[PDB]
Amino acid sequence: RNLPIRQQMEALIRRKQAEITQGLESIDTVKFHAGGGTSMVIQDGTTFEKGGVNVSVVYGQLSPAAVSAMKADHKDGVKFFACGLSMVIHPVNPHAPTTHLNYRYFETWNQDGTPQTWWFGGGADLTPSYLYEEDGQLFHQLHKDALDKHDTALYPRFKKGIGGIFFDDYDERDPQEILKMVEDCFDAFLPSYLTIVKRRKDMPYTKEEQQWQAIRRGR
Structure with a gap:
């Protein structure tokens, strides 16, 4: 029983939005500041140059035109709920890596009961400027450890520069x-x-190393 999965997922991502921005703030000098989800943004910190942590919720219908365009990747029209958190953090220092993270949930409705269909999707990765194999290895280890709490088959399947984990549908x-x-x-x-x-974050670098990594990576 508990609450509906939809309720529990929305609660979870909103708690993690708060837990993550606070954690990131703990190593910077600057704070995050707040359809249309709820987007928290950090800018010009001493550790983080730009970043955002967003939670979005969407209720609606998808046209048959829409569903038609869509079903390559999921096992008139349809009513649905979805929610998700997404983030991207880019450190000031090129020795520190960018990260992206996204966890989301989707379910269809329309005479409810419980279902028609639902799924989760997500994962997390790092995109380094300078590459440190040890950083990739720790990132992977702890995500492996999380997935191994459920079963040791998941990490080998969801794994994959550094990469990370990804799953969908x-x-x-x-x-x-x-x-x-x-x-x-x-x-x-x-x-x-x-x-x-x-x-x-405190490894020495020059402005030119930072500009070259910006050229190499873009933007």
Whole structure:
């Protein structure tokens, strides 16, 4: 029973939005500031140059035209709910890596009961400027450890510069368990990323190394 999966997922991502921005703030000098989801943004910190952590919620219908355009990748028209958190953080120092993270959930409705269909999607990665294999290895280890709490087959399947983990259209188990797997994946983030940024953010660099990495990576 518990609450509906939709309620529990929305609650989880909103709690993690708060837990993540606070964790990232703990190593910077600057704070994040706040359809249309709720987007928290950091800019011109001493550690983080630009970043955003967003939670979005959407209720609606998808046309048959829309669903038509869509079903390559999921196992008149349809009513749905979806929610998700998305983030991208870019450190000032080129020795510290960019990260992206996204966890989301989608379910169809229309005479409810419970279902028609639902899934989760997400994962997390790092995009380095300078590359440190040890940072990639810690990032992977802690996400592996999160996934191994559920089963050791998941990491080899979801894995994959540094990369990270990615899954989508994932509805293969009781959604209560998949909720816990998503929570545990979230909890892999701050211990890996704050560790990595701490150990890189004060490494010396010149303006030219930073400009060249910007050229190489874009933007």
